[PDB]
Each structure stands twice: as structure tokens, then as C-alpha cells.
Amino acid sequence: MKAVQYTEIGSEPVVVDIPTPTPGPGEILLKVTAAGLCHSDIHVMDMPAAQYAYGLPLTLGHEGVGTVAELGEGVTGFGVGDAVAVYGPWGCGACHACARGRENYCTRAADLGITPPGLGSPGSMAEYMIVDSARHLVPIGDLDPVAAAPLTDAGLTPYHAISRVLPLLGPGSTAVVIGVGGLGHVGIQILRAVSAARVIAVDLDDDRLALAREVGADAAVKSGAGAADAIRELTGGQGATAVFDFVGAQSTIDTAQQVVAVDGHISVVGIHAGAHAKVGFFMIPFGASVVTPYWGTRSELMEVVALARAGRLDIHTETFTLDEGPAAYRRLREGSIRGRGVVVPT
Amino acid sequence: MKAVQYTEIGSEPVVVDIPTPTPGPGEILLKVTAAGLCHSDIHVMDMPAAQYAYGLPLTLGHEGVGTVAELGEGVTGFGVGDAVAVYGPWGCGACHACARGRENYCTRAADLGITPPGLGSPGSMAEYMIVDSARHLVPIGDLDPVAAAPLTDAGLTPYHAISRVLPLLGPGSTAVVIGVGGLGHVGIQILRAVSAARVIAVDLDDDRLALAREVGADAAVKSGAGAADAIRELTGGQGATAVFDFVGAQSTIDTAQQVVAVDGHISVVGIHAGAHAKVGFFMIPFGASVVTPYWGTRSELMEVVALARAGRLDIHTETFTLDEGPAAYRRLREGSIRGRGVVVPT
Amino acid sequence: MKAVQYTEIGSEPVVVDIPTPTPGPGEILLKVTAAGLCHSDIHVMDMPAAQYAYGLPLTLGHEGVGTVAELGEGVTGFGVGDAVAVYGPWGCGACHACARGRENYCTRAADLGITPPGLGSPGSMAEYMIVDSARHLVPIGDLDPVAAAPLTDAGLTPYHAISRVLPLLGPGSTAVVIGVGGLGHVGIQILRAVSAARVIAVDLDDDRLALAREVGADAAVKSGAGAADAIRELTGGQGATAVFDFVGAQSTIDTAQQVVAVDGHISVVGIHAGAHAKVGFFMIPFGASVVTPYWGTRSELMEVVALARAGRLDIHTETFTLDEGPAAYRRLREGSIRGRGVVVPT
Amino acid sequence: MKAVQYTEIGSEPVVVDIPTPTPGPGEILLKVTAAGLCHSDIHVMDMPAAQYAYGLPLTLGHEGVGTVAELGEGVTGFGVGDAVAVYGPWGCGACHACARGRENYCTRAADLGITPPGLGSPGSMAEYMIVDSARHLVPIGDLDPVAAAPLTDAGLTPYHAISRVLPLLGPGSTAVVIGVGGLGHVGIQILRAVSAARVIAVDLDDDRLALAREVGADAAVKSGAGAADAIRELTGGQGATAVFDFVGAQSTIDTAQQVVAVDGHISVVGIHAGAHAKVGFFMIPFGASVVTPYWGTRSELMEVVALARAGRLDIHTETFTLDEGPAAYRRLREGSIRGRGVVVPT
Ligand SMILES: NC(=O)c1ccc[n+]([C@@H]2O[C@H](COP(=O)([O-])OP(=O)(O)OC[C@H]3O[C@@H](n4cnc5c(N)ncnc54)[C@H](O)[C@@H]3O)[C@@H](O)[C@H]2O)c1
Ligand SMILES: NC(=O)c1ccc[n+]([C@@H]2O[C@H](COP(=O)([O-])OP(=O)(O)OC[C@H]3O[C@@H](n4cnc5c(N)ncnc54)[C@H](O)[C@@H]3O)[C@@H](O)[C@H]2O)c1
Ligand SMILES: NC(=O)c1ccc[n+]([C@@H]2O[C@H](COP(=O)([O-])OP(=O)(O)OC[C@H]3O[C@@H](n4cnc5c(N)ncnc54)[C@H](O)[C@@H]3O)[C@@H](O)[C@H]2O)c1
Ligand SMILES: NC(=O)c1ccc[n+]([C@@H]2O[C@H](COP(=O)([O-])OP(=O)(O)OC[C@H]3O[C@@H](n4cnc5c(N)ncnc54)[C@H](O)[C@@H]3O)[C@@H](O)[C@H]2O)c1
Ligand SMILES: [Zn+2]
Ligand SMILES: [Zn+2]
Ligand SMILES: [Zn+2]
Ligand SMILES: [Zn+2]
Ligand SMILES: [Zn+2]
Ligand SMILES: [Zn+2]
Ligand SMILES: [Zn+2]
Ligand SMILES: [Zn+2]
């Protein structure tokens, strides 16, 4: 089969021909319909030799959607042909967190050598992929695969971050969304669908501010030095109930701290090495919690899919072939994809 | 192997010799260390011919603990010898409720013919039992099997009922526990371990009131017409924040309605066919929710086990052999078991 | 001043001339801008001699909005002219429930003789009204008084009922709203603003079903014997996560029980003497809680007002003068007001 | 009347004779029965001239308990003689946070010049004190005033910090308490009363570790470089579900970050200027929230009082006279009070 693999350190990913795999007992083989490109796949290929621990070669792609091609022995709940989205953050399935579906917060996955597809196990950027267990498949029915693929991470991750403090986001509340990219443009829509929060979007790019308005933001503010005061102008000096920072650079976190409300929240979702919120007295309002969430839960993915199927999630995508995969990753580096890049095997 | 089966309608269960089963892919074979007798096993054998739909024969026992004897193909997370408790209320594992571990509230288990062990599938009152999936096994480590078996239902069910309204049971709250039997005597202990609620126990039998005091009740009141006013004497006329009725007869539910607080809760856990709370204006206080909960969740079972391992759950038991099983069920009918009856295969 | 009072038992309310009151220490005198007519004002006038305990005469109207006319001694937080909505369900202010703003669930208001305006204290259907305390005034800013008056009950009461089980109403959930009248048409809009629940409206009147679609319902079904099965057709046989029954007759409650989901909720908000949910095993799904909620909380009223100010609550009203008050109550009996009737003193 | 006032900057507080105040409308005059000394009163007197904004003179003491001496006009809910504890963190009473009793998180108290007694308004370290409003009085009944005074802050503050993440602290959870002083020794007891968390105490002083065991800690560990690894030894390498750091120095926060669990919590309750948690990816586990909580809520104070009245809070105290006040503050500087210092006016 055809696939995109990261085959040497510091070199760009290449199109390859590898064995179509077979499912063993418990596993499921999917024909891939769509495979999302995430900014996190860049962090993975930018890792030095000493830091990279996902093994070589590695079939990329942790945002996966497909149709069931073959059942491994003993597997029930799925028939051949069912369209399914792949739950990425695989856990052990047995710990207290995993039993609540919160496999993203699995404590023992590291020690047992369970790694996500695209981040240690063969991923979705291939004609077929293996899924370890039936519990990591989420039905999508007649959902367009191209729009479903980003739901597995670009939808799931903001959905989770928002879900953690959803009780705070009642009528009267204000949610700030920093970074209207893959994640943030879905985050805005989530906030609108599951809350009455006023949504303020923040980005450097005026085109991305326009995108924020397109997908439901009540206001849009240019990022940088002016941002915090412009957000306080909009909030009447009360601050933002929640900041969802999908950029996660120091300047965005600083902004988040300067605007968050007393008893509010900051969710640092974007990843910049070294960047951190400084949570201590006089550096942040009273009661303003900060967290770095990770991916999301099984029940949350199903909820994201239910939003997509209800028409509440317009996911802006561009389609690529497997051959155009390498090129698409380069496009993702330059920031020229207006939403999410998706690969469709022909 | 030796087992206790319900073989004919209306007739008492008998000791039998049946094939030691083999695990297929995904399944786990356990040697049984302990098997609990529940009052619900009586309701099952008292069902008429037309109502009984669990099939014949049926190996009894839905409270199960064991050691892993054999792994079916593809099963990981457990090695031979691990002591495990069996999660009873099996669900489909894939629905929104099941993905949160809430397999007790699985919507699709009925239509798929997934039934608990002891209530449609072979149960624990046998030398060995099959468990369908790894996710239905909960490690107990070095916990005494005899005291662990009741945790799977007698602990789990009250733990769940209490868990649903645990936010209400803060300092200042009062919890009434009606029926200090298998479930209720564990319920009292749970309330003490996980809340600061004042605990008032209610029972007909003065011996069971003594048992309530033994396990942590702050007061004990004889049941009947006088119970409500005696509970109001203790609560200063404010009412009970929560009533956990483990009897569930009409008179106990009536009592529960006459004592529950404004914005409080009634959990009808005991089962008497025809009995019901009457929830309508003027028949119950404002904001006083009522529910009939069912069994409990995967994460809840682990929590109950963690309580047992921490020394917070004194489970009063009497041990029986497989041969004494039939006799132990007659003893459970008369109400002569002070706590929970447990069968240990020799 | 002019007002509408209930002056003798079983007789209709009449227009009267009574002293313009003065605020004592702590109190606030409002000039009334709008005064809502609620179906509950009918139940009050339908009470027999023996049951009626609100005193005579009684200035009607528990849905009140005004402008501050005079401050009683020691009162701060409000200046003359501020437009305010009146929080109706007055409590003692000191108990555990009142300290959380939950004055609707005040335990000690009954024994202290604190009664709502319009239901024991002088109400809003007058040129001026007294409010006991500053904590019972909610700023509305430039909100149209006519549309703000229903927020105090018609908005607040459904907002509360929904707030209690809001965690259940995620994407994928279904909320049924029975009775698309004053309350129910605001309930539908609340569900849309604060949740991603699919909203199914139920009413006897096809015109009210049209009204349900106008205000955002995803479907509408005629009430009666057919309702339950038509709701199950729409939910795929899964049932309704939540039923908010604003009629509260036995037939609507029966419907609610026949459609509610496993681990779902029924909120009996409408009031029919004798009507009740029958909550017991086999009469309702496992885990399906039932409650009769009452009015709502202080923080909830502010939230309802925040929804109105954000444009999320189209409140359908008809305006009346104080002279047309009596007539407007007769019009409310026949069910000819399409939404909520509001009295505006000139 | 006699009182202790901070009268010049950088000078120690002195015993003075000032007018017995009179309550105006809404206010309540209390005869003080007990007045707690908090470490925060030291931070206040250590402030430079430029930073100190509480006005001079200032009657100290923000932990206050008394009996009602006189009612201001219009005040109801309290009769002369009622023993009451004073809710310290006064807010505006009208905002969304204040209406939920969360006056600690009042957004508008700063701009309105509402300041706590002992931190801007006359405090409790005097024969009498004024309380602005009835809502800031909490009945204590026959509770010993000396043991009730610390409940208003030393009890309330840890109760709040714990209350925020109480859902995390189920059976199986571990709570670390760093600093077994005034606050921390009450925090340990709270954790035991309202949760099944395993409690690990951390302190520099072996005497304070002994105190931790006296009041219910399951283990005790010497603070410093070794602390984190010793906590991980106890938790099986899983980490602590929650860290409540009542010291709040950088080294304790660093420790808290090195031991907190994935999806856990750090509550930085102690105050060291400049100290902060560094919440960013790779510097703290996934999902581990951090917050600096402030004081606590009205309903929480009542809950703390209910714990004291139930016998669940052994508050270690030493009594002082008003004359010994100055000396008692010097004793608090050196750290020679084993628990909380309380002043009783003679
Ligand atoms: N927490 C998790 O588990 C998780 C999951 C998936 C992705 N991520 C991370 O989230 C981040 C975002 O992913 P994406 O694919 O949505 O990003 P992206 O590449 O699609 O674009 C990010 C957006 O942020 C904007 N931006 C850049 N710098 C900015 C600044 N200083 N201020 C304001 N806006 C700025 C860009 O204009 C763009 O609109 C990445 O760092 C990624 O690694 C985290
Ligand atoms: N909700 C669920 O999923 C679930 C799970 C397990 C059991 N159950 C049900 O819970 C009930 C209790 O189970 P158990 O095993 O503790 O029962 P048990 O027979 O072991 O003990 C019953 C106790 O209730 C007392 N009692 C009887 N009548 C009473 C009255 N009028 N007032 C007060 N007390 C009275 C008895 O004296 C005894 O102490 C059973 O009826 C069973 O069907 C429900
Ligand atoms: N819980 C509380 O504190 C509280 C507060 C306010 C009002 N209420 C109660 O709520 C109820 C409704 O109040 P309202 O003023 O909104 O009513 P309304 O008179 O304004 O509207 C009634 C609506 O219910 C519909 N209806 C009547 N019978 C029906 C049936 N069998 N099936 C379906 N729909 C039916 C009517 O067609 C109409 O659309 C009243 O009984 C009132 O007393 C309760
Ligand atoms: N959040 C709020 O509003 C609020 C309210 C009251 C107090 N506080 C703050 O809480 C803090 C604690 O108050 P307290 O009155 O309990 O203090 P205290 O002086 O009574 O107790 C200090 C305790 O911490 C221990 N300690 C000191 N350094 C340590 C280290 N490196 N590692 C471990 N333990 C150490 C000491 O041995 C002692 O047991 C203060 O800094 C105070 O300002 C905050
Ligand atoms: Zn990703
Ligand atoms: Zn796990
Ligand atoms: Zn049972
Ligand atoms: Zn299921
Ligand atoms: Zn009303
Ligand atoms: Zn009250
Ligand atoms: Zn203090
Ligand atoms: Zn406030």
C-alpha cells in the first residue's frame, strides 16, 4: 500500500510502498477515507535525534477516518463498511481515568508502550491503518470523511479544553479564543453551540479575524501589544471568564493573564517550548485557574461528531492526495492552509 | 466443574456438574475465589414462567471475584494469577454512556442481548467463570476475596446511588438510610467515608439498628408510621438532605417523601414491584429530586475497591461452600444473614 | 395610586385606588414600568376560602420591572432612575440555600412570614411597588420593560429547570418541551442558547407548535396519546435526555415517562393538583431523575437577563393597561394570549 | 472601648482607647467574644508606606466572632445575644459572584471601596465591632468562641481551596498538604471529614509532622529536596491527585509541580511575593490545573461551622487578652504558636 512515512531524522516525509497490514485478535483494519494534518506532526519531525522516541519508520497521521475493511478475530460492534473516526489518544483501557473514557489522561500507557497512531504506532496517512481495539472507533455514519477527519483532534482538543470549564461559560460570560487556525476556528464554533458565552477572537492575521467572524465570533481583535486593553474595552473592565489560547506562545499567555477574570480560567492549548503561565499571587487574578489540557476523551469525541452531524461545525478544509502529502506538510509550515489540511487516499 | 444453577421455574437452585468453559478471543477465564448472594437473585427465581427471560439453565451469582486462570487470545493487561473483581452490569462498551464507564446505563445492551453474569450469562457461583472482556475486570490485589465479592454490588450499588447526589451531602447535610441489610450497612459506611453527612439509619429490626450503629450511623430509628416524625425530631424540622431507601416498599418511599428536604433527594434503590415515589406539586418538597438508580459504573467499582483496600468498608459476611449454596438462599429468604452471604468454591 | 387587587374570594380582580407606599429602612420604592401576568395568578384566585392564606386585599403581579423612585434609609447599590427587574421568590437571605442565592429553596421563609410580591406581599400590578431589599433587584439597563417583565418568572422558571440538568444536555442530547405557552416558548429559546440539545416541542394547539418553530424548536408534535411514539420516532428509539413539562397534567407526565431516556430527567414544572410522576422500578427508566422545581435563583435571574440583553430571548408579549388588567386575566383563562400578557401603568 | 490598632507604618500595633461605635441602618454591632490572629495581618504591617492602602488608624483582626449587642434600624434575622461568626471577605452583594455567596470573588468590591474588617474597615481585635450587613453574620449557636474564630479564615480558606476540586478527591485519590500550620492543620482535618483522599502532610518541623498525624494525616514527610521523591514513593509513582500548598514559597510550589498527577490540581494558598507555579507544556503534567484561591464563600463558612459543631474540626488554639495582643503578634512572627492565636476581650 501507499503511505507517507517519516524515515530519517530532520528529513522531510516521503511517499512509500509498504505491506497492507492484517488485523490480529481484537484489532480492526480500516481503509482510510481521510487523514488530517496537524501542527503537532511538525513538532514531531522537528525533534532532534536524542528526543525522538517514536521509532523509524513511522506512518504519519493521528487524525484518522475510514471504513472497516477487515475484523480481527473476536471483534464485534462493527460490520465491514461502517464509516468510523479513530480516537487518537490511546490508553490502557483499565485504569480509573480510562474507565471513564479519559484515555487522554491514562497514567499507565507510557509504561505499557501504548502510543497513538501517527505518534508511535502506524498512522492514518496511508491507504489502510490498524486500530488496536473497537473502543477506539467512533461511528460517523454519512458524515463527509474530509470534514470528519479534523474532528478527531482539531475538534476534539478544543472541545475538551472548553468542556473542562463549561460550567463557567453561562449567559453573561466572555470566552476569548487566541489563534484562529485549525483548532481555534473550531473552538469558536464549539463555544457557540454549547454555551451562551460572548466569543472574542484574537489573531495576528486580519484574514483569520475574518474567518473568526465567518464562524460566529462576536468580535475580533488584532493580537500584540494592544490586545489585552481592547479585550478589556469589550468586557467593560470585568475581564474574560475564559481564555482558550491555541497559540500558547509567551506573548499570548501574557495576554491571557492580563485579561482573565477573577474566578475565571486560562487553557493553554497551543504548544511553545518554554512558554508558561505564571500562576501566583499578584501575577494572576484570584481564583483564575490555569491548565494545559491534552487531546480529549472518548465521550467528548462522540459529542464532537454529534455536533458535526447536527450541522453545528463548519470545518474549513483543503484536500490533498497521498502524493501531495509531503507538499501539504510544507504548506502547513508556512501557515498557508486556511483551516485544516486533509489527505484522501485514491 | 461444580456450580449452583436455577434449572426449573419456581423450584430452588441445585448443585450441578457442568463443563469447565474455555475463553475465546477477548475473554478471560477466572477461577472463582468468592461469589456473593444478593436479594435480587431471589426476585429472579420468584419470577413466573412468562416473565423469566434469562434462559435455563442459569449459573447464579452476579457478585464475583476470582483469579485469572486463562487468557483468551489477544487479551492483555492481566497475567495469570491476578486477583480481580467482576464488573457486573455489562454494556456494549461503545455508546456514549459506556465510553464514560457508565455501562449500567447502556442504551443498546438490551437490543444486543448483553446480559450480566448471573442474570443471563453464566455467573460466579461455580469453580470457574467466563468474563467477556478485560474492561469488566477490576484488580483487587491482596484484598480478602470474601470481603471483596459484596463490593461488586452490595458496595457498588449504594456507592452509585450516593455518588449521584454527593454534591448535596456537605457538612450540615443529613442522609437517611432506610434498610440496614446487605446494601444499607455498606451505604452507611460509604456516606461516612466520602461525606460529612449526619447519617440516620432506619430499620424494622432492632438488631439491624445495632448493626447501623456498629458501622457508623449517628442515629437509628425504628421504621413504620412513627419514623418520619422521629427523623424530623433529629433534623430540627429541616428534613433530610438525602434519603437512600434500600427497601423500596411503598411505606418506606412514603416515609422518604415525608422527611426529604426542600432541594434534597430520594434514591429509591430497593425493589418492590408497584411501589413508587409520587413526584408532583404538594406531594413532595420543591426541588426534591427522585430517581431509581441501577447498579453502578466502572470507575465507581474501582472507587469502592479503593475504599475497601483503605480499610473504610467493614463488610459483614458469612461464608458458605458451593454445596451449602441452596441452603444459603433459603437463609437469605428468611432474613437470617447479618450482612451478605458469600460462597467460596473449595 | 392605581392597582389591580384580589379583594374577595372567588370574585375577579378589580381596579382600585390605594396609598402610594413609602419605603422604610432597607426597602426600595419602584415606579412600575411592566407587570407580567402568570398562569400561577389564576391558581391563586381559584383557591377556596380555607386554602387561601395570602391575605386580603392583595395587589397582584409577581413578575415585576420598574425604575427606582425612592431609596429607603441605608440603601446603596441603586440610584434613582435605575431600571430593575424584581427577583420574586424572596427568602430569608441568611440560610445555607439563601447564601448561595437559592432563595427559591429557602427553608425558613415560611416560618418567618416572608412571601413573594403578588403572592402575599403587594405586587407589581400597580403604578408603584415596594421591594424589601436591594438584593431582590436585578439591573436590566436599556432592556425594554415589556420584554423584561416575563424574564422574572416565565424566563427564570424554565431557566432554573433546565439549569438543574444542564450537564446532561450535551451534543447528541434531546430535550422535549411540553407546553409552548408563556414559559415553554422561552424554555425552547433557553435550550438553544445554553445547550446543543435537539429541541422537540409538544402542544395541543397547532398555532403553539408554529410558535415553537418560530422560536427555534427542531421539531413539533401534537400532544395526546400519539405524542410519545412520535417523540420516539424523532429520537431513533433512544428516548429524550430531558423532558421539561410546563403543563404538568397527568397525561403530559405520562408522556414524559414514556419518552425519557435511561439516565435522563423529567422536570415537572407545570402545576396540576393531583398530578404526579410515578417514580419506581419498571415505571420509569433506570437513572431517570424526576423533580418539581420552583421558580429560580438570584444568579439565574441575572443569567436570564444577560440572555435577553444578548438578543437570545424573543419574548412574545401583548401589552395591557391597568384598566385592562381584569380583562387580561379573563383572556389568560381562555388561553388566547400568544405568549405572555404584560401590564404597563400609564 | 479597648482595641489593638496599627497606628504608624513599620511600628508594632498598640493597645488603644477609642469610641464604642453605633450601628446605622442595615448594620449590626457585636460584642466581640473572640478575635483570631492570622499570618496575613503580618504581611499587612510589613507593607511599605507606598504599598499600604488600608488607612490609619486600623483596628486589626479579620477573624471575628461575637454576640449581637445592637441592631441598626431595619435589620431582621438576628436577636440581641445571638452568637455569630463574621464572614470576612465582604463584597458588593449584588454581582453574579456575590449573589451565589461568592463574595470572595466579587468583581466590584475594589472599585466601590468595600474592604474586609481588619483589612480596611474596623476589625475584631476590640471589645465591639461593626458589621455592615446581616448577610455577613453566620450563627454559631453554643460553639466555643475561641475555637470558632479561626473557622472564619484558618478553616474557611483551606475549606474553599479543597472545595474547588472536591470532585477529584474520591476514594483512590491522594491529597498532599504542604505546611501544617494554622491553615494546614485544619486542611488535613477537612480532607478527612469531606473526602476519602489519602492525606500526605509535608512540613520542615518534625513537631508539625507530629501535629499532622495527631489530626489525621496518613503520612508525613520532611520538606525540602527529598520531599517530591518521598511523595512519589508513597503514591506508587502515580503522583498526588491534589496538592494544597499552604506555604506557597517557590520551593514548595516546585515540589507541588514535581508530584501532582496527570489531571490533578495544585492550589497555591500560601503567599510569598514573586512565587508562582509555571504552568506550560513539559513543566507540569497534562490536565493538572493550578489556582491561587482567595478566602472562601458564605455557604462554605456555614459548612465549616457545621463541621466544627459536629466535632470534626479540632482547632489547636492559644488564648490571649487584648493587652497581650501586641506580644501575640511578635509570637506569631517567630512561629511559636502551635496552631492559631486568638484574642478574647475581658
Ligand atoms: N493540547 C493538545 O493536546 C493539542 C492537540 C492538537 C494541537 N495542539 C497544538 O495547538 C497549536 C495550534 O494548532 P493548529 O493546527 O490549530 O494551528 P495552525 O497552524 O492551524 O494556526 C494557528 C493560528 O494561530 C495564529 N497565531 C500565530 N501566532 C500568533 C500570536 N502571537 N497571536 C495570535 N495568533 C497567532 C495564526 O495566524 C493561525 O491562525 C499547535 O501548537 C499544536 O501543536 C495541541
Ligand atoms: N438498584 C439496584 O440496582 C439494586 C441492586 C441490588 C439490590 N437491590 C435491591 O435492594 C434491596 C435491598 O437489598 P439487600 O441485599 O440489602 O436486602 P437484604 O434482604 O439483605 O436486607 C434487607 C433489609 O431491609 C430491612 N427492611 C425490610 N422491610 C423494611 C421496612 N418496612 N422498613 C425498614 N427496613 C426494612 C430488613 O430488615 C433488612 O435489614 C432488595 O430488595 C434488592 O432487590 C437493588
Ligand atoms: N414551578 C414554578 O414555580 C412555576 C412558575 C411559573 C409558572 N408555573 C406553572 O407553569 C404552567 C404554565 O405556565 P404558563 O403561564 O407558561 O402557561 P400558559 O397559559 O401561558 O400556556 C399554556 C400552554 O400549555 C399548553 N397546553 C395545555 N394543555 C396541554 C396538553 N395537554 N399538552 C400540551 N400542551 C398543553 C397550551 O396550549 C399553551 O400553549 C402553569 O401551570 C403555571 O402555574 C410554575
Ligand atoms: N488565601 C487567603 O486569602 C489566605 C488567608 C489566610 C492566610 N493565607 C496565607 O496562608 C499562609 C499560611 O498561613 P498559616 O497562618 O497557616 O501560617 P503559619 O505560620 O501558622 O504556619 C506555617 C507552617 O508552614 C510550615 N513551613 C514553612 N516553610 C516550609 C517549607 N519550605 N516546607 C514545608 N513547610 C513549611 C511551617 O513549619 C509551619 O508549619 C500564609 O502565608 C498566609 O498569608 C492566605
Ligand atoms: Zn494533533
Ligand atoms: Zn489507562
Ligand atoms: Zn444484586
Ligand atoms: Zn453501551
Ligand atoms: Zn408565576
Ligand atoms: Zn433562607
Ligand atoms: Zn487571614
Ligand atoms: Zn459583588
> Where does B61-162 show beta strands of DSSP type E?
63-71, 83-86, 128-131, 137-139
CB-based contact, B276 to chain C, within 8 Å:
yes
Burial of D45 (0-12, 13-18, 19+ CB in 10 A): middle
Pairing of strands C174-178, C240-245: parallel
Q: Spell out the SS3 assignment of C180-213.
A: CCCCHHHHHHHHHHHCCCEEEEEECCHHHHHHHH
Burial of D273 (0-12, 13-18, 19+ CB in 10 A): exposed
> Distance between CA atoms of C103 and C91, rounded to whole angstroms?
5
User: Do residue D241 and residue D338 come from a single domain?
Assistant: no
Where does C12-130 have alpha helices with state H? 40-46, 96-99, 109-112
Q: Which residues of A touch B101 (CB under 8 A)?
A: 99-101
**All residues at 6 or more sequence positions from A127 whose CB lies less than 8 Å from its CB, including other chains:** A1, A2, A3, A20, A31, A32, A322, A345
How many beta carbons lie within 10 A of that of residue D7, not counting itself? Answer: 13
Instruction: For residue D179, give the ligand 4 atom closest to its CA.
Output: 24
> Distance between CA atoms of D329 and D342, rounded to whole angstroms?
10
Say what the resolution is, in angstroms. 2.5
Pairing of strands D14-17, D2-6: antiparallel
**All residues at 6 or more sequence positions from D131 whose CB lies less than 8 Å from its CB, including other chains:** D27, D28, D29, D30, D86, D117, D137
Place of cell 487553557: A267
**Of B255, B271, B294, which residue constitutes the final position of a domain?**
B294
> Distance between CA atoms of C152 and C139, rounded to whole angstroms?
12
Handedness of CA A262, A267, A272, A276 (dihedral sign): positive
> Distance between CA atoms of C208 and C212, rounded to whole angstroms?
6
Q: Count the domains in chain C.
A: 2
Site from C27, C28, C76, C297 to mutate, D interface, most D CB atoms within 10 angstroms: C76
User: Do residue A153 and residue A85 come from a single domain?
Assistant: yes
CATH number of the domain where residue D218 is located: 3.40.50.720
Q: What own/partner pairs with CB < 8 Å and gap ≥ 24 does B118-122 have?
A: B118/B41, B118/B58, B118/B59, B118/B60, B118/B61, B118/B62, B118/B63, B118/B64, B118/B88, B119/B40, B119/B44, B119/B54, B119/B62, B119/B88, B120/B54, B120/B55, B120/B58, B121/B90, B122/B21, B122/B58, B122/B59
* Contact of C206 with A208, CB cutoff 8 Å: no
> Distance between CA atoms of C267 and C243, rounded to whole angstroms?
6
DSSP one-letter code for A230: H
Closest residue by Cα to atom 10, ligand 2, is B270
H/E segment holding residue D298: helix D298-309
CATH number of the domain where residue C335 is located: 3.90.180.10
Chain B partners (3+ C-beta pairs within 8 A): A, C, D
Cell of A126: 496511508
> Distance between CA atoms of C120 and C57, rounded to whole angstroms?
10
* Contact of A123 with A117, CB cutoff 8 Å: yes
**Of D255, D277, D294, which residue constitutes the final position of a domain?**
D294
User: Does D287 contact A291 at a Cβ distance shorter than 8 Å?
Assistant: yes
Burial of B81 (0-12, 13-18, 19+ CB in 10 A): exposed
Q: Which residues does residue B174 pair with via DSSP β-bridges, in sequence order? A: B198
Ligand 9 ion: residues within 5 Å (CB):
C 38, 40, 153
> Distance between CA atoms of B271 and B114, rounded to whole angstroms?
22
Identify the residues whose C-beta falls under 6 Å from ligand 3: C 38-40, 43, 153, 157, 178-184, 202-205, 208, 223, 246-249, 251-252, 269-271, 293-295, 335
* Contact of D108 with D326, CB cutoff 8 Å: no
Q: Spell out the SS3 assignment of D74-89.
A: CCCCCCCCCEEEECCC
> Distance between CA atoms of A139 and D32, rounded to whole angstroms?
66
Q: From the CA atom positions of chain A, what is the Rg in Å? A: 20
> ω into residue D145 within 30 of 0, thus cis?
no
User: Do residue A6 and residue A131 come from a single domain?
Assistant: yes
DSSP one-letter code for A126: B
> Where does B7-140 show beta strands of DSSP type E?
14-17, 28-37, 58-59, 63-71, 83-86, 128-131, 137-139
Experimental method: X-ray
User: Do residue D318 and residue D342 come from a single domain?
Assistant: yes
Select from B315, B328, B321 the least CA-distant residue to B344: B321
User: Where in the sequence is the domain holding A53, given as residue range(s)?
Assistant: 1-157+295-346
DSSP one-letter code for A72: P
Place of cell 416498599: B249
> Distance between CA atoms of A278 and A250, rounded to whole angstroms?
10
User: Do residue B19 and residue B139 come from a single domain?
Assistant: yes
Q: Which residues of B touch C292 (CB under 8 A)?
A: 279-281, 284, 286-288
Q: How far is CA C118 from CA C56, C126, C319, D336, in A?
A: 12, 11, 19, 60
User: Do residue D54 and residue D137 come from a single domain?
Assistant: yes
User: Do residue D228 and residue D174 come from a single domain?
Assistant: yes
User: Do residue A105 and residue A172 come from a single domain?
Assistant: no
Place of cell 512558554: A275
* Spacing, Cα B102 to ligand 8 middle (Å): 8
> Distance between CA atoms of B46 and B66, rounded to whole angstroms?
28
User: Do residue B19 and residue B106 come from a single domain?
Assistant: yes
* Spacing, Cα B237 to ligand 10 middle (Å): 14
Count Cβ neighbours within 10 Å for each residue of D309-337 and write b for 16 or more, e otherwise. beebbebbbeebebebbeebbebbeeeeb
Distance from CA of A287 to the nearest CA of D (A): 5
User: Do residue A168 and residue A255 come from a single domain?
Assistant: yes
> Distance between CA atoms of B278 and C278, rounded to whole angstroms?
5
* Contact of A75 with A26, CB cutoff 8 Å: yes
Q: Phi and psi for D329 in degrees, rounded to 5?
A: -70, -40
Select from D88, D119, D117, D85 the least CA-distant residue to D315: D85
What's the gap between Cα C263 and its chain centre? Answer: 26
User: Does C306 contact A195 at a Cβ distance shorter than 8 Å?
Assistant: no
> Where does D254-306 show beta strands of DSSP type E?
260-268, 277-279, 289-291
How many beta carbons lie within 10 A of that of residue D225, not counting itself? Answer: 9
How many beta-carbon contacts under 8 Å exist across B and D?
Answer: 44
Handedness of CA D285, D290, D173, B102 (dihedral sign): negative
Cell of B207: 438488631
User: Do residue D132 and residue D244 come from a single domain?
Assistant: no
**Of D294, D312, D336, which residue constitutes the final position of a domain?**
D294
Pairing of strands D240-245, B317-320: unpaired
* Spacing, Cα C107 to ligand 10 middle (Å): 6
User: Do residue B13 and residue B141 come from a single domain?
Assistant: yes
Pairing of strands B28-37, B340-343: antiparallel
* Spacing, Cα A3 to ligand 8 middle (Å): 34
> Distance between CA atoms of B103 and B98, rounded to whole angstroms?
5
* Contact of A321 with A343, CB cutoff 8 Å: yes
Handedness of CA C116, C118, C121, C124 (dihedral sign): positive
Q: How far is CA C49 from CA C53, C56, C116, in A?
A: 8, 11, 20
Instruction: For residue C185, give the ligand 3 atom closest to its CA.
Output: 16
Select from B114, B152, B144 the least CA-distant residue to B37: B152
> Distance between CA atoms of D219 and D239, rounded to whole angstroms?
15
Place of cell 488608624: D57
Sheet holding C240-245, edge to edge: B219-222, B198-203, B174-178, B240-245, B260-268, B289-291, C289-291, C260-268, C240-245, C174-178, C198-203, C219-222
**All residues at 6 or more sequence positions from B274 whose CB lies less than 8 Å from its CB, including other chains:** B250, C280
